[PDB]
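thread from #wetlab-drylab

HS: before we spend reagent money on co-crystallization trials with sodium ion, can we at least see a predicted complex? here's what I'd submit
DV: go for it
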Amino acid sequence: KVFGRCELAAAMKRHGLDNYRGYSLGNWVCAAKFESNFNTQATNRNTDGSTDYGILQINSRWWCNDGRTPGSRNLCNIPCSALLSSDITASVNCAKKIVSDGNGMNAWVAWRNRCKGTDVQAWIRGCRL
Ligand code: NA
């Protein structure tokens, strides 16, 4: 599923992401735009053999199991495929663990490089929230 911008903002807000670990909602929408283009089925293979899954491109080295990332963890206790669903519940709940890992949203390289320090409120402009 490819979310509309405000459609995603709404779903993220309902799942408690607005100011989760102090990151306002626009951060998460920004991250999702550059990570997945709002597409829940996005995947990317990493050079270390791990794979990123879903709307927030969550990685198999630590957070989900795909059975093909040797020596990896599954700290969100989910199959990575769950991160590709049209329902973003699994992605949001896993993201909450990632962002609590110590480095905040810097865990997402795209957020650090393209959202951090920008006017992220623009990503929820026009949205009925
Ligand atoms: Na990415």
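DV: Residues 35, 44, 57, 110 surround sodium ion (CB under 6 Å).
HS: ok that's useful, forwarding to the group
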